[PDB]
Amino acid sequence: TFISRFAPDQPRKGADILVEALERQGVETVFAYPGGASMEIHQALTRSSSIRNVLPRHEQGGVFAAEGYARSSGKPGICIATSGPGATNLVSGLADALLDSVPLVAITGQVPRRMIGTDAFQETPIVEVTRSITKHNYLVMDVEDIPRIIEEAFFLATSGRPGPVLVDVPKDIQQQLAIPNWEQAMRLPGYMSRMPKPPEDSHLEQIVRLISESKKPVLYVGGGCLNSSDELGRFVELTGIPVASTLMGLGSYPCDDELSLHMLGMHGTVYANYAVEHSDLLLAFGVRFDDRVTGKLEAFASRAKIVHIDIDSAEIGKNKTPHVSVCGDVKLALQGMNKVLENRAEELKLDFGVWRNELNVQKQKFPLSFKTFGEAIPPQYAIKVLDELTDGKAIISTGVGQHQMWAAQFYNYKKPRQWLSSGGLGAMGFGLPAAIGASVANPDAIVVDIDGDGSFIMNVQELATIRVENLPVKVLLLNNQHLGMVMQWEDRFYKANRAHTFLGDPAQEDEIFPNMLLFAAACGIPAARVTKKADLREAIQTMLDTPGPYLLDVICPHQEHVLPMIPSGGTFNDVITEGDGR
Amino acid sequence: GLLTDEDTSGLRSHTLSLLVNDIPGVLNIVTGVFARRGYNIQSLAVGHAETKGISRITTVIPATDESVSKLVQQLYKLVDVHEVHDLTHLPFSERELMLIKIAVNAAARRDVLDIASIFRAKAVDVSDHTITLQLTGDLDKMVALQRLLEPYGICEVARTGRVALARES
Amino acid sequence: HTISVFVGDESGMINRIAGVFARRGYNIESLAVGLNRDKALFTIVVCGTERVLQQVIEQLQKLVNVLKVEDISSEPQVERELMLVKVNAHPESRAEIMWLVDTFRARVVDIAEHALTIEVTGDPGKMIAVERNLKKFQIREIVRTGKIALRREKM
Amino acid sequence: GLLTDEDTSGLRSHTLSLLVNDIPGVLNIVTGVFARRGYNIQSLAVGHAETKGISRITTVIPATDESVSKLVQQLYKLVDVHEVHDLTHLPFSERELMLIKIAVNAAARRDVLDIASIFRAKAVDVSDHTITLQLTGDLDKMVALQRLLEPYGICEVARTGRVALARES
Amino acid sequence: HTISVFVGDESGMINRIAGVFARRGYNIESLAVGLNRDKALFTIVVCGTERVLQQVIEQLQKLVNVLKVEDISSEPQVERELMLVKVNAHPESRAEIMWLVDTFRARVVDIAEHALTIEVTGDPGKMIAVERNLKKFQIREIVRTGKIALRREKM
Ligand SMILES: Cc1cc2nc3c(=O)[nH]c(=O)nc-3n(C[C@H](O)[C@H](O)[C@H](O)COP(=O)(O)OP(=O)(O)OC[C@H]3O[C@@H](n4cnc5c(N)ncnc54)[C@H](O)[C@@H]3O)c2cc1C
Ligand SMILES: Cc1ncc(C[n+]2csc(CCOP(=O)(O)OP(=O)(O)O)c2C)c(N)n1
Ligand SMILES: [Mg+2]
């Protein structure tokens, strides 16, 4: 039973129909940059207290907060932008949630429907701009079918590969007064034809008929186990396969058990690449098999037999050819995998100690070491410092780049969605606004954050959102005055130059740029600035007890580079062995 | 530069019979996928299917069936697509009208309509400035007429693109 | 309210075109296009007023690849629309589709015992006949090309 | 030397409708008899009969019916022959297609298709180099067209040989 | 996988030809030939791979009388195959073979009260239609010539 804010037969502004239809899905936090054209929905918000406006400081910060609330809860996050230019700034985060497969909903105003696309004022035909980068768009032309498409949006947000749905409403639609006809069905006829049915064990038979055939398995898990809390851990409790977790799957397998292969691929852990490029059956639970993990299409575990479980039918065979393939919701089909294979628990193989012996001799022979050149803090140490101090579970946001994988390869994750990424979009500036939404998905819980020196700056505006919303974000700044990802891509691609990698001021290159203390002190937030390891455990000690938010500022050494890095279309033969910036 | 060019097929040339809703922008959501999958669309012809309220797009894509399997399920990722049918590995009707205006004189108009009588082209409109044929059938009969009407004073060949249904026979 | 578009050297020529009816919010009634290596002649009918038709004949020329847009509506056209209807070929009811494809004067390309396929061609007035008159027999799957127009040229 | 010659009949010219199995070499067992009985085979056209699994050969042999009675029972000495029918002393349909490519110019192509319109010859393929008729009917209409297309630039007359069934009328 | 053969002055020209598919063990799918006093144009489709097709286009030139063998398969051909079907002409079921010979557009040469004879001509796709579509009426005796091909010649 929905607690209706008003009468069920009140002909009112469509934003009232809209904002009730959000709470009728059961959502509680929006991100609503205010409306010179989406005006009524912020007005209809203010007559509600079940929904919360975390009003961002930028709409790209807003949609990344709508990312950050989505992929730190699993509830489909809702941004609201103003029409036109506000909606153009979603196009960042909508391109995140499609590539990162994140259930997002983007409500946005449009202009009057008598003025749509007329080269009008405050207009961007964003229903047609973001056609290529969302799961669905909407351009509703009546009040009576506003919650038709809204429940269809949250259908399309939850169902299939969970994508973003930009849902647009014209300004004169909410300024048109009509009655909410609530319970009408999903006008969604084609999507039910591939609304993915539960794949039964007869389809999973040729997985488990090949589990015993598998001598060298690997558990190539990723963003499809984003709902698998312990179901993947139950699966490895049943059969014991060494994992290979990607970035949206970092957390899914709690990466501190015996098969602790953190991240695989071209930038992963080199001993998980050894785990994946030596298998005879590449078992995959929810991965998109991209270029910067596979390297080559045909040589990425060429000696394996790919099985690949996805909710998305189109993903199956998209980047990588599968040997035998089965669709279906993984966490549902894992409950139809582990809770059915107990009849075969005395029948199945479990003979992977000779495969667990391969990783053990190559765990330490292929290590996760660093170079403490003097005392300039290895950030790869500083995240092993993090889980030494963050008391275990920590919901962590990241920007992207060299500092992205430093959280990946060097934090011991304990739960999916207690981790944020942009691996698909690879969005710089995603980090700190992802800490905004994570601090309302899991508000009281530890929302620690890390950001690079530019990606912190690239969305530094949403620092002001924190003090307004009292969020306890714990943001680290892995500063190196440098575009930290592509400076290694100078070296290992072509040349050891410094071609526009230097982010800092060349007049004060030895000094900090910019002064992130006086960033947080500008928005009144407490801050720090770290370069030495003695204060490193001290600063996080000051961080996790700080009331409300906290910033700090480690200094990454500007010439420190990460294994591995292959050119696109590569194998583990083409690994780099020790690449630095010196 | 007057006439549309010769033929709309290569070697690969897969045909996909889309079946989408009658959304006002539903073409742009569908060829939006052909663009965003890096496919040239060699020919396309949309129209309203048997259930009035949905559409039907018949496309021609130069892609091998490995890449088409990266499209038929990828076109399923669209919301409005009810079904796609890779007709190219099936026997299928391939009929396409082709309105060919040809500028002719009086005596040459005799030596055009006979060719139009060969192809069962109903010469839909004639003047003294010109005659406009309208032939229909497979694309080989389309390209045969245009290969044979290039000797004559052709004008705007307003074609329509390959339209298909897989025959049961 | 119909438009013929001639476009030049690009790929995804339709995406420029079918965008700028959707992003302009002006609905296409139908469309078809004979694409080639560099040339394509669209034929687009847009169910709008002549005022908004005057916009989109020039707003489609805000696109770059368009060599020519001509609103062909005012001319005496030849609107010819093909419709490869696949009809249920049950011989209890096939027996009258015989003349009811002879009336519309269309070939029948492929026949099965329960599915025959006809090739109705021409005036959309005659096409909406078949979409209604042959709807009285159970239709498997109508596929139809878009309405194509040309100038009935005299001087 | 391009065209096939004029006609496939003499005075005697018996026709035998064979009815043989669909053995892969079953033609060579049948014309093996026409050779080993010293018969020239004036025309022959094989094909699959009404029961899919058997064939049907329609032959033309210049032999009088005394010598044909030394063949119809002699063809019965073959194993695969189910029946032979001496159709020549019966009324029988005698239809034979005849694909006649003719090299023509533009104006002469007018003065060919009209002749093809006389014989109800569907001009199956046309170019500017040539036109290829396809007429069908009795062999007299076959030889009449080839006697009338020898004035034109004929090309490979890909005939098919007399095909027969004895009419019940 | 089809072959056109032009042969010279001998008798029993077919015996050289129909031998060297049997004695080579490579099955003919169909055959027909317009023999004359010295000339004959075979048209042989051999259901084999293009490798073994490459053999028999030259192994038939191991015969002496063959003036020319051309594998016509790669060309755009005109495969036209006649099929003088004699159909049971019962007027309860004759009444629909009327249009079902008009669809395939064939003359009907001789009619009796229980046996009519049609003359279906052309594409083997259209011929296997009649062999299936008119199989739904009781067929007395199909006789068919072999598929005949020619070059759709352009330069
Ligand atoms: C510069 C850079 C370098 C990188 N290097 C690497 C690397 O070396 N190795 C590596 O592994 N990653 C790397 N990444 C990250 C990588 O780009 C993404 O993590 C990966 O492409 C997407 O994650 P995923 O495929 O595992 O899951 P996602 O793509 O995020 O989603 C899982 C996939 O399976 C299916 N799925 C989605 N939802 C569900 C569901 N609810 N149930 C079942 N199935 C579902 C979907 O089809 C989806 O495609 C890098 C990223 C960047 C930006
Ligand atoms: C706007 C944008 N530009 C460029 C990139 C590609 N890119 C990702 S990270 C990166 C450099 C990394 O800098 P930063 O994100 O601040 O973290 P760092 O590794 O320097 O600590 C680049 C060039 C991107 N994802 N987004
Ligand atoms: Mg940085």
Short mmCIF file of N, CA, C and O in Angstrom, two decimals, chain A residues 98 128 131-136 138 156 161 188-191 193-194 297 312-321, chain B residues 19 21 23 25-26 28-30 32-33 36-37 54 66 69-70 73-84:
data_model
loop_
_atom_site.label_atom_id
_atom_site.label_comp_id
_atom_site.label_asym_id
_atom_site.label_seq_id
_atom_site.Cartn_x
_atom_site.Cartn_y
_atom_site.Cartn_z
N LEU A 98 25.45 3.26 -18.84
CA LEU A 98 25.27 2.27 -19.89
C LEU A 98 26.48 1.37 -20.00
O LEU A 98 26.35 0.15 -20.06
N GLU A 128 16.89 12.76 -27.91
CA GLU A 128 17.53 12.31 -29.13
C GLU A 128 19.04 12.42 -29.07
O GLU A 128 19.72 11.72 -29.83
N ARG A 131 20.14 9.10 -27.23
CA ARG A 131 19.53 7.89 -27.75
C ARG A 131 20.54 6.76 -27.80
O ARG A 131 20.20 5.60 -27.53
N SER A 132 21.78 7.08 -28.10
CA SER A 132 22.78 6.05 -28.31
C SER A 132 23.43 5.58 -27.03
O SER A 132 24.17 4.59 -27.06
N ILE A 133 23.21 6.26 -25.90
CA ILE A 133 23.99 6.01 -24.71
C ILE A 133 23.13 5.69 -23.50
O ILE A 133 23.64 5.66 -22.39
N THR A 134 21.83 5.51 -23.68
CA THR A 134 20.99 5.07 -22.59
C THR A 134 20.31 3.76 -22.98
O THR A 134 20.30 3.36 -24.14
N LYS A 135 19.75 3.11 -21.97
CA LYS A 135 18.98 1.91 -22.25
C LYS A 135 17.66 2.26 -22.91
O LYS A 135 17.21 1.55 -23.82
N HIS A 136 17.04 3.34 -22.48
CA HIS A 136 15.86 3.85 -23.15
C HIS A 136 15.74 5.33 -22.86
O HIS A 136 16.28 5.84 -21.88
N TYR A 138 12.67 8.70 -23.19
CA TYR A 138 11.24 8.93 -23.16
C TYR A 138 10.94 10.40 -23.43
O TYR A 138 11.70 11.27 -23.01
N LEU A 156 12.81 -0.76 -16.83
CA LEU A 156 13.99 -0.78 -17.67
C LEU A 156 15.25 -0.44 -16.89
O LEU A 156 16.35 -0.79 -17.34
N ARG A 161 20.29 -5.99 -18.65
CA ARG A 161 21.50 -5.24 -18.38
C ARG A 161 21.05 -3.90 -17.83
O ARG A 161 20.43 -3.13 -18.56
N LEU A 188 5.37 -2.01 -22.88
CA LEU A 188 6.74 -2.42 -23.09
C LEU A 188 6.77 -3.75 -23.82
O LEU A 188 7.34 -4.72 -23.32
N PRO A 189 6.18 -3.84 -25.01
CA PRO A 189 5.80 -5.16 -25.53
C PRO A 189 6.97 -5.95 -26.08
O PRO A 189 7.00 -7.18 -25.94
N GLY A 190 7.94 -5.28 -26.70
CA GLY A 190 9.08 -5.99 -27.23
C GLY A 190 10.03 -6.44 -26.15
O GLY A 190 10.69 -7.47 -26.29
N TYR A 191 10.10 -5.70 -25.05
CA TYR A 191 11.09 -6.00 -24.03
C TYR A 191 10.73 -7.25 -23.25
O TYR A 191 11.62 -7.92 -22.70
N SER A 193 9.69 -9.87 -24.69
CA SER A 193 10.12 -10.98 -25.53
C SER A 193 11.55 -11.42 -25.23
O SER A 193 11.95 -12.50 -25.65
N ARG A 194 12.32 -10.59 -24.52
CA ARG A 194 13.66 -10.97 -24.09
C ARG A 194 13.87 -10.64 -22.62
O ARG A 194 15.02 -10.56 -22.17
N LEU A 297 41.32 -10.47 -28.98
CA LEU A 297 40.02 -11.14 -28.98
C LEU A 297 40.18 -12.65 -28.94
O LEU A 297 39.52 -13.33 -28.15
N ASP A 312 22.25 -10.15 -20.02
CA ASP A 312 22.13 -9.47 -21.30
C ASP A 312 22.40 -10.45 -22.42
O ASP A 312 23.47 -11.08 -22.47
N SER A 313 21.44 -10.59 -23.34
CA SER A 313 21.60 -11.50 -24.46
C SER A 313 22.58 -10.96 -25.49
O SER A 313 23.34 -11.74 -26.09
N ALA A 314 22.59 -9.65 -25.70
CA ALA A 314 23.45 -9.05 -26.72
C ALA A 314 24.91 -9.11 -26.34
O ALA A 314 25.77 -9.15 -27.22
N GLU A 315 25.20 -9.11 -25.04
CA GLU A 315 26.58 -9.18 -24.59
C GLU A 315 27.21 -10.52 -24.94
O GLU A 315 28.40 -10.58 -25.26
N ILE A 316 26.40 -11.58 -24.97
CA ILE A 316 26.87 -12.93 -25.23
C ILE A 316 27.39 -13.00 -26.67
O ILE A 316 26.62 -12.87 -27.63
N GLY A 317 28.70 -13.16 -26.80
CA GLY A 317 29.32 -13.17 -28.10
C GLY A 317 29.64 -11.81 -28.68
O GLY A 317 30.05 -11.74 -29.84
N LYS A 318 29.48 -10.73 -27.91
CA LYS A 318 29.70 -9.40 -28.47
C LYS A 318 31.18 -9.13 -28.68
O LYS A 318 31.64 -8.93 -29.80
N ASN A 319 31.95 -9.13 -27.59
CA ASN A 319 33.38 -8.92 -27.71
C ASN A 319 34.14 -10.22 -27.85
O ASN A 319 35.10 -10.30 -28.62
N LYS A 320 33.72 -11.26 -27.14
CA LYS A 320 34.43 -12.53 -27.08
C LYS A 320 33.50 -13.65 -27.51
O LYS A 320 32.36 -13.72 -27.05
N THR A 321 34.00 -14.52 -28.37
CA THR A 321 33.24 -15.69 -28.77
C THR A 321 33.18 -16.68 -27.61
O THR A 321 34.22 -17.03 -27.05
N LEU B 19 11.14 -5.42 -36.57
CA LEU B 19 9.72 -5.36 -36.24
C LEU B 19 9.61 -4.51 -34.99
O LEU B 19 9.78 -5.01 -33.87
N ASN B 21 7.96 -0.88 -32.80
CA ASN B 21 6.76 -0.12 -32.52
C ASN B 21 6.64 1.05 -33.49
O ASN B 21 7.59 1.43 -34.17
N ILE B 23 6.68 4.16 -32.85
CA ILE B 23 7.14 5.39 -32.20
C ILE B 23 7.50 6.39 -33.28
O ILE B 23 7.97 5.98 -34.36
N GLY B 25 9.94 8.40 -33.52
CA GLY B 25 11.35 8.42 -33.84
C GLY B 25 11.96 7.04 -34.00
O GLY B 25 13.18 6.90 -33.94
N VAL B 26 11.12 6.03 -34.25
CA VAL B 26 11.55 4.64 -34.10
C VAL B 26 12.53 4.23 -35.19
O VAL B 26 13.27 3.26 -35.02
N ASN B 28 15.02 6.26 -36.07
CA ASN B 28 16.28 6.77 -35.57
C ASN B 28 16.79 6.00 -34.38
O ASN B 28 17.98 6.06 -34.08
N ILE B 29 15.92 5.27 -33.69
CA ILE B 29 16.44 4.40 -32.66
C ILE B 29 17.02 3.15 -33.29
O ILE B 29 17.92 2.52 -32.72
N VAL B 30 16.57 2.78 -34.49
CA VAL B 30 17.00 1.54 -35.10
C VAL B 30 18.24 1.75 -35.96
O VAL B 30 19.24 1.05 -35.79
N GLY B 32 20.01 4.25 -35.53
CA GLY B 32 20.94 4.64 -34.48
C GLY B 32 21.80 3.51 -34.00
O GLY B 32 22.94 3.72 -33.59
N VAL B 33 21.30 2.28 -34.08
CA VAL B 33 22.11 1.13 -33.71
C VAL B 33 23.06 0.76 -34.84
O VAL B 33 24.22 0.43 -34.59
N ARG B 36 25.78 3.27 -34.52
CA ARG B 36 26.61 3.08 -33.33
C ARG B 36 27.25 1.70 -33.26
O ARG B 36 28.09 1.48 -32.39
N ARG B 37 26.89 0.78 -34.15
CA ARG B 37 27.65 -0.44 -34.32
C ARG B 37 28.59 -0.37 -35.50
O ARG B 37 29.14 -1.39 -35.91
N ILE B 54 2.43 -1.11 -34.85
CA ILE B 54 3.85 -1.45 -34.90
C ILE B 54 4.32 -1.22 -36.33
O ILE B 54 3.52 -1.13 -37.27
N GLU B 66 28.65 -13.47 -38.39
CA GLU B 66 29.26 -13.31 -37.08
C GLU B 66 29.02 -11.91 -36.55
O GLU B 66 28.61 -11.72 -35.40
N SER B 69 25.26 -11.45 -35.89
CA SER B 69 24.90 -11.95 -34.57
C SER B 69 25.33 -11.00 -33.46
O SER B 69 24.76 -11.03 -32.37
N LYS B 70 26.30 -10.13 -33.74
CA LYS B 70 26.60 -8.99 -32.88
C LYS B 70 25.69 -7.81 -33.16
O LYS B 70 25.96 -6.72 -32.66
N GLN B 73 21.05 -9.58 -31.84
CA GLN B 73 20.82 -9.47 -30.41
C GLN B 73 21.10 -8.07 -29.92
O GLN B 73 20.52 -7.64 -28.93
N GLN B 74 21.96 -7.33 -30.62
CA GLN B 74 22.21 -5.95 -30.24
C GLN B 74 21.02 -5.07 -30.58
O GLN B 74 20.69 -4.15 -29.82
N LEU B 75 20.34 -5.34 -31.69
CA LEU B 75 19.09 -4.64 -31.94
C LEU B 75 18.00 -5.05 -30.98
O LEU B 75 17.07 -4.27 -30.76
N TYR B 76 18.10 -6.23 -30.38
CA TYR B 76 17.19 -6.58 -29.31
C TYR B 76 17.40 -5.72 -28.08
O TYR B 76 16.47 -5.56 -27.29
N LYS B 77 18.59 -5.14 -27.91
CA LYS B 77 18.83 -4.26 -26.77
C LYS B 77 18.02 -2.98 -26.87
O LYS B 77 17.81 -2.31 -25.85
N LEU B 78 17.55 -2.62 -28.06
CA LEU B 78 16.54 -1.58 -28.17
C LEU B 78 15.25 -2.01 -27.51
O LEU B 78 14.93 -3.20 -27.42
N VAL B 79 14.49 -1.03 -27.07
CA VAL B 79 13.25 -1.32 -26.37
C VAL B 79 12.14 -1.65 -27.35
O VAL B 79 11.41 -2.63 -27.16
N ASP B 80 12.01 -0.87 -28.41
CA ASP B 80 10.86 -1.00 -29.28
C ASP B 80 10.92 -2.19 -30.22
O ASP B 80 9.89 -2.53 -30.82
N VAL B 81 12.08 -2.83 -30.37
CA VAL B 81 12.19 -3.95 -31.29
C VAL B 81 11.48 -5.16 -30.72
O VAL B 81 11.86 -5.68 -29.67
N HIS B 82 10.45 -5.63 -31.42
CA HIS B 82 9.81 -6.86 -30.99
C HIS B 82 10.57 -8.08 -31.49
O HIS B 82 10.81 -9.02 -30.72
N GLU B 83 10.98 -8.08 -32.75
CA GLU B 83 11.81 -9.16 -33.25
C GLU B 83 12.67 -8.67 -34.40
O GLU B 83 12.33 -7.70 -35.08
N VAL B 84 13.79 -9.34 -34.59
CA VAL B 84 14.61 -9.21 -35.79
C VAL B 84 14.69 -10.60 -36.40
O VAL B 84 14.70 -11.61 -35.69
#
